[PDB]
Scaffold this active site. Structure first.
Site, PDB file in Angstrom:
ATOM      1  N   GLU B  58      31.837  38.575  38.454  1.00 58.47           N
ATOM      2  CA  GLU B  58      32.897  37.857  39.168  1.00 58.47           C
ATOM      3  C   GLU B  58      32.322  37.028  40.319  1.00 58.47           C
ATOM      4  O   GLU B  58      32.608  35.845  40.461  1.00 58.47           O
ATOM      5  CB  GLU B  58      33.888  38.844  39.729  1.00 58.47           C
ATOM      6  CG  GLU B  58      35.131  38.160  40.274  1.00 58.47           C
ATOM      7  CD  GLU B  58      36.112  39.087  40.962  1.00 58.47           C
ATOM      8  OE1 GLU B  58      35.687  39.973  41.708  1.00 58.47           O
ATOM      9  OE2 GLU B  58      37.312  38.909  40.759  1.00 58.47           O
ATOM     10  N   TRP B  80      41.027  38.909  35.208  1.00 56.23           N
ATOM     11  CA  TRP B  80      41.770  37.664  35.431  1.00 56.23           C
ATOM     12  C   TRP B  80      42.637  37.123  34.280  1.00 56.23           C
ATOM     13  O   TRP B  80      43.268  36.071  34.376  1.00 56.23           O
ATOM     14  CB  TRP B  80      40.783  36.596  35.847  1.00 56.23           C
ATOM     15  CG  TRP B  80      40.289  36.824  37.262  1.00 56.23           C
ATOM     16  CD1 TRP B  80      39.022  37.278  37.491  1.00 56.23           C
ATOM     17  CD2 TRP B  80      41.014  36.650  38.412  1.00 56.23           C
ATOM     18  NE1 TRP B  80      38.932  37.403  38.786  1.00 56.23           N
ATOM     19  CE2 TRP B  80      40.079  37.046  39.378  1.00 56.23           C
ATOM     20  CE3 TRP B  80      42.294  36.231  38.788  1.00 56.23           C
ATOM     21  CZ2 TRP B  80      40.412  37.033  40.733  1.00 56.23           C
ATOM     22  CZ3 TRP B  80      42.631  36.215  40.142  1.00 56.23           C
ATOM     23  CH2 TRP B  80      41.696  36.615  41.104  1.00 56.23           C
ATOM     24  N   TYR B  94      39.370  31.107  44.310  1.00 57.37           N
ATOM     25  CA  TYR B  94      38.152  31.325  45.096  1.00 57.37           C
ATOM     26  C   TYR B  94      36.968  30.391  44.960  1.00 57.37           C
ATOM     27  O   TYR B  94      36.702  29.576  45.841  1.00 57.37           O
ATOM     28  CB  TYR B  94      37.635  32.707  44.860  1.00 57.37           C
ATOM     29  CG  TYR B  94      38.649  33.758  45.232  1.00 57.37           C
ATOM     30  CD1 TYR B  94      38.903  34.031  46.576  1.00 57.37           C
ATOM     31  CD2 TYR B  94      39.339  34.431  44.218  1.00 57.37           C
ATOM     32  CE1 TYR B  94      39.825  35.004  46.916  1.00 57.37           C
ATOM     33  CE2 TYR B  94      40.271  35.408  44.561  1.00 57.37           C
ATOM     34  CZ  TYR B  94      40.504  35.681  45.903  1.00 57.37           C
ATOM     35  OH  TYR B  94      41.439  36.629  46.245  1.00 57.37           O
ATOM     36  N   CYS B 146      43.629  37.055  47.837  1.00 54.89           N
ATOM     37  CA  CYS B 146      43.660  38.320  48.589  1.00 54.89           C
ATOM     38  C   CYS B 146      42.579  38.434  49.663  1.00 54.89           C
ATOM     39  O   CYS B 146      42.839  38.764  50.826  1.00 54.89           O
ATOM     40  CB  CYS B 146      43.441  39.543  47.731  1.00 54.89           C
ATOM     41  SG  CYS B 146      44.792  39.615  46.556  1.00 54.89           S
ATOM     42  N   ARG B 166      44.159  39.850  53.279  1.00 54.96           N
ATOM     43  CA  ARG B 166      45.604  39.855  53.534  1.00 54.96           C
ATOM     44  C   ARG B 166      46.454  40.901  52.792  1.00 54.96           C
ATOM     45  O   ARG B 166      47.350  41.542  53.357  1.00 54.96           O
ATOM     46  CB  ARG B 166      46.197  38.494  53.217  1.00 54.96           C
ATOM     47  CG  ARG B 166      45.669  37.861  51.937  1.00 54.96           C
ATOM     48  CD  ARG B 166      46.661  36.898  51.309  1.00 54.96           C
ATOM     49  NE  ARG B 166      47.692  37.595  50.572  1.00 54.96           N
ATOM     50  CZ  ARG B 166      47.845  37.492  49.246  1.00 54.96           C
ATOM     51  NH1 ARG B 166      47.114  36.727  48.428  1.00 54.96           N
ATOM     52  NH2 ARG B 166      48.817  38.184  48.712  1.00 54.96           N
ATOM     53  N   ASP B 169      44.871  46.358  47.326  1.00 57.46           N
ATOM     54  CA  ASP B 169      45.119  47.491  46.420  1.00 57.46           C
ATOM     55  C   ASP B 169      44.035  48.559  46.620  1.00 57.46           C
ATOM     56  O   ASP B 169      42.956  48.546  45.999  1.00 57.46           O
ATOM     57  CB  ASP B 169      45.120  46.986  44.967  1.00 57.46           C
ATOM     58  CG  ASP B 169      45.644  47.954  43.895  1.00 57.46           C
ATOM     59  OD1 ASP B 169      45.534  49.173  44.008  1.00 57.46           O
ATOM     60  OD2 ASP B 169      46.160  47.467  42.898  1.00 57.46           O
TER      61      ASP B 169
HETATM   62  C1  LIG Z   1      47.529  44.983  41.171  1.00 59.40           C
HETATM   63  C2  LIG Z   1      46.209  44.306  41.246  1.00 59.40           C
HETATM   64  N1  LIG Z   1      46.097  43.030  40.852  1.00 59.40           N
HETATM   65  C3  LIG Z   1      44.907  42.405  40.861  1.00 59.40           C
HETATM   66  C4  LIG Z   1      44.832  41.061  40.484  1.00 59.40           C
HETATM   67  C5  LIG Z   1      43.643  40.646  39.889  1.00 59.40           C
HETATM   68  C6  LIG Z   1      42.464  41.150  40.438  1.00 59.40           C
HETATM   69  C7  LIG Z   1      41.300  40.384  40.361  1.00 59.40           C
HETATM   70  C8  LIG Z   1      40.106  40.880  40.879  1.00 59.40           C
HETATM   71  C9  LIG Z   1      40.046  42.182  41.398  1.00 59.40           C
HETATM   72  C10 LIG Z   1      38.745  42.715  41.853  1.00 59.40           C
HETATM   73  N2  LIG Z   1      37.659  42.453  40.914  1.00 59.40           N
HETATM   74  C11 LIG Z   1      37.400  43.328  39.782  1.00 59.40           C
HETATM   75  C12 LIG Z   1      36.096  43.441  39.252  1.00 59.40           C
HETATM   76  C13 LIG Z   1      35.820  44.312  38.167  1.00 59.40           C
HETATM   77  C14 LIG Z   1      36.877  45.063  37.632  1.00 59.40           C
HETATM   78  C15 LIG Z   1      38.159  44.940  38.150  1.00 59.40           C
HETATM   79  C16 LIG Z   1      38.444  44.072  39.207  1.00 59.40           C
HETATM   80  C17 LIG Z   1      39.009  45.852  37.403  1.00 59.40           C
HETATM   81  N3  LIG Z   1      38.149  46.525  36.451  1.00 59.40           N
HETATM   82  C18 LIG Z   1      38.733  47.275  35.345  1.00 59.40           C
HETATM   83  C19 LIG Z   1      38.376  46.560  34.012  1.00 59.40           C
HETATM   84  C20 LIG Z   1      38.979  45.164  33.844  1.00 59.40           C
HETATM   85  C21 LIG Z   1      40.471  45.064  33.544  1.00 59.40           C
HETATM   86  O1  LIG Z   1      41.301  45.653  34.233  1.00 59.40           O
HETATM   87  O2  LIG Z   1      40.819  44.313  32.635  1.00 59.40           O
HETATM   88  C22 LIG Z   1      38.281  48.750  35.363  1.00 59.40           C
HETATM   89  O3  LIG Z   1      38.015  49.357  34.326  1.00 59.40           O
HETATM   90  O4  LIG Z   1      38.215  49.331  36.441  1.00 59.40           O
HETATM   91  C23 LIG Z   1      36.897  46.055  36.559  1.00 59.40           C
HETATM   92  O5  LIG Z   1      35.917  46.426  35.892  1.00 59.40           O
HETATM   93  C24 LIG Z   1      41.219  42.968  41.461  1.00 59.40           C
HETATM   94  C25 LIG Z   1      42.468  42.432  41.060  1.00 59.40           C
HETATM   95  C26 LIG Z   1      43.727  43.085  41.263  1.00 59.40           C
HETATM   96  C27 LIG Z   1      43.932  44.357  41.852  1.00 59.40           C
HETATM   97  O6  LIG Z   1      43.083  44.926  42.531  1.00 59.40           O
HETATM   98  N4  LIG Z   1      45.131  44.957  41.719  1.00 59.40           N
HETATM   99  O1  LIG Z   2      40.699  40.922  44.961  1.00 60.84           O
HETATM  100  C1  LIG Z   2      41.816  41.415  44.839  1.00 60.84           C
HETATM  101  C2  LIG Z   2      42.914  40.758  44.160  1.00 60.84           C
HETATM  102  C3  LIG Z   2      44.173  41.342  44.185  1.00 60.84           C
HETATM  103  N1  LIG Z   2      44.375  42.473  44.831  1.00 60.84           N
HETATM  104  C4  LIG Z   2      45.748  43.009  44.800  1.00 60.84           C
HETATM  105  C5  LIG Z   2      46.522  42.794  46.090  1.00 60.84           C
HETATM  106  C6  LIG Z   2      47.930  43.192  45.691  1.00 60.84           C
HETATM  107  O2  LIG Z   2      47.916  44.606  45.452  1.00 60.84           O
HETATM  108  C7  LIG Z   2      47.993  42.379  44.372  1.00 60.84           C
HETATM  109  C8  LIG Z   2      48.324  40.894  44.611  1.00 60.84           C
HETATM  110  O3  LIG Z   2      49.742  40.771  44.979  1.00 60.84           O
HETATM  111  P1  LIG Z   2      50.235  39.841  46.114  1.00 60.84           P
HETATM  112  O4  LIG Z   2      49.634  40.356  47.337  1.00 60.84           O
HETATM  113  O5  LIG Z   2      49.796  38.471  45.902  1.00 60.84           O
HETATM  114  O6  LIG Z   2      51.696  39.885  46.219  1.00 60.84           O
HETATM  115  O7  LIG Z   2      46.654  42.459  43.778  1.00 60.84           O
HETATM  116  C9  LIG Z   2      43.387  43.170  45.506  1.00 60.84           C
HETATM  117  O8  LIG Z   2      43.610  44.139  46.212  1.00 60.84           O
HETATM  118  N2  LIG Z   2      42.135  42.599  45.471  1.00 60.84           N
END
Ligand SMILES: Cc1nc2ccc3ccc(CNc4ccc5c(c4)CN([C@@H](CCC(=O)O)C(=O)O)C5=O)cc3c2c(=O)[nH]1
Ligand SMILES: O=c1ccn([C@H]2C[C@H](O)[C@@H](COP(=O)(O)O)O2)c(=O)[nH]1
Ligand SMILES: Cc1nc2ccc3ccc(CNc4ccc5c(c4)CN([C@@H](CCC(=O)O)C(=O)O)C5=O)cc3c2c(=O)[nH]1
Ligand SMILES: O=c1ccn([C@H]2C[C@H](O)[C@@H](COP(=O)(O)O)O2)c(=O)[nH]1
Lengths: 264, 264
Positions: B58, B80, B94, B146, B166, B169
């Protein structure tokens, strides 16, 4: 204030000596956060005398979208004068970014009225942000913004605010920057029929300049007095309609003012 | 890790129950900061298994200015996917802002080149910032930033970084976001011949989703273990040509990876 005197003691005990663009030299820490529950009192320093008139006029000036110093002159505010060109302009700073951030395609976003419409229709949003850090116009600004970014949050019918300040002159700028933001939280809460929550301050480069060290040790030898009260005597039709005389400060009794040089 | 786990219990003891855009519900606090000394190891969680290959992919995707999830598909990163349009695009998110923040006057600004030149020519600078919060373009992004704003700092030969996130999660995103930026601090320290300093995290709406309480309770009973050590197996000609092959974590002995529902 307890929180303020404790940041001063922390930069003195943990600050490393840094150099800075104004030549003057500083003691410096990076990364600090402190909180003020605005129902305890209005957060204006009692260990040295500050002047409300100036905090208020700069806030009214930001809210009109103004970046020329003549308004401030009319009301005896002088701190912006070294940065102003021959016409009194500071360039696209705070007031401009707040009210009219320029987008790539012609548009202008008023970030203050957006925030008032988020607190009204959607107070649970995690996007109730106002940013002054417009990377694109930073080359045109007289000073790149110190108090660059802030975020509002609503809880039990209570409005909170968090500010990210990238650079902070602890002794001179910070008494005025926290009073300024705490005043904007009573103004936005009154407009939204919300109560006042917390004003959370976070700093990047948090510092004391080298020619403030006697001053700092003098203020810190003063114990704080009780925190003053803010009374707004009028709920205006909009946030842009506050005049200086709507605000009364009660119970303010400070130690003597302490002067100190502004690094250029 | 102990900072991360202390935050997790804080959201349970003190968090306000809020309704959020997904409907899912949340437990929430506002304003929280965490200091990670990067000399002590790499701040990747040990209480549940995190997968470094997705963190590192990423972040290289960001550093190249790419907003299409095509790269992340070549290298199997999903996440994503619900936010991308049929052509694989997320809008000016980003990477687009880090590498090409667009002016009103046509031109672009490469905030990572700017920030590398500032670290190599003016390290005392209190303006070494990069922002992803592009107000004139938030409406064209699939999901608003975020991890919105960060600042670099150089003190005694050490490079420190502070983040403003801001919306956070705590269970899902926060482990990945801490490693991601701590990782960037190591690539920047390496390109600029500085030692690594502190990684400071600052959150706005820090929250735990309702349908995560079991997994959170499982995680809070597991003890933390020692942090890993991040070896960067080579020194690239620029910060733009690093690769998956180049990163190695010695000492990572985590507890098993815990499955938990994501909110849309
Ligand atoms: C509710 C929520 N929404 C999001 C929106 C998109 C995001 C984009 C990036 C990240 C942070 N970057 C990563 C980087 C790697 C992984 C993950 C997230 C999630 N994750 C999953 C696999 C990927 C998936 O969920 O499809 C896992 O198994 O833990 C990863 O390997 C989090 C969110 C959130 C997030 O944290 N939570
Ligand atoms: O890098 C990231 C991307 C997203 N989120 C989380 C934040 C919220 O839990 C949700 C996005 O919702 P909004 O804050 O935009 O409403 O995904 C993370 O914590 N980290
Ligand atoms: C190094 C440095 N540079 C600055 C330059 C721009 C600033 C603009 C505004 C503020 C914060 N806002 C106000 C707004 C009003 C006043 C003051 C500060 C300080 N103050 C002067 C009064 C000047 C006078 O004599 O008229 C004082 O020191 O008491 C004011 O009345 C701080 C700075 C700093 C700052 O504090 N530090
Ligand atoms: O509201 C303000 C405006 C400015 N400053 C201080 C921060 C630095 O001491 C100086 C600005 O210099 P640079 O950080 O840009 O270098 O003015 C404040 O503390 N508060």
């Amino acid at each position: 204030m307890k929180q303020y005197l404790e940041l001063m003691q922390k930069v003195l005990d943990e600050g490393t000596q840094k150099n800075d663009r104004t030549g003057t030299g500083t003691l410096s820490i990076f990364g600090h956060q402190m909180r003020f529950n605005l129902q305890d009192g209005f957060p204006l320093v009692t260990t040295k005398r500050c002047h409300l008139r100036s905090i208020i006029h700069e806030l009214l000036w930001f809210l009109q979208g103004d970046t020329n110093i003549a308004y401030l002159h009319e009301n005896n505010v002088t701190i912006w004068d070294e940065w102003a060109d021959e016409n009194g302009d500071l360039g696209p700073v705070y007031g401009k970014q707040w009210r009219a951030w320029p987008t790539p395609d012609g548009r202008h976003i008023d970030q203050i009225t957006t925030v008032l419409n988020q607190l009204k229709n959607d107070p649970d949003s995690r996007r109730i942000i106002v940013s002054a850090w417009n990377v694109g116009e930073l080359d045109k600004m007289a000073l790149a913004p110190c108090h660059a970014f802030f975020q509002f949050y609503v809880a039990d019918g209570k409005l909170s605010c968090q500010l990210y300040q990238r650079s902070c002159d602890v002794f001179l700028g910070l008494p005025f920057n926290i009073a300024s933001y705490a005043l904007l939280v009573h103004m936005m809460a009154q407009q939204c029929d919300l109560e006042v929550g917390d004003f959370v301050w976070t700093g990047g480069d948090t510092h004391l300049y080298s020619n403030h060290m006697d001053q700092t040790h003098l203020q810190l030898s003063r114990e704080p007095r009780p925190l003053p009260k803010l009374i707004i005597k009028r709920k205006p039709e909009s946030i842009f309609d506050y005049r200086f005389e709507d605000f009364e400060i009660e119970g303010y009794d400070p130690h003597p003012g302490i002067k100190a040089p502004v690094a250029i």
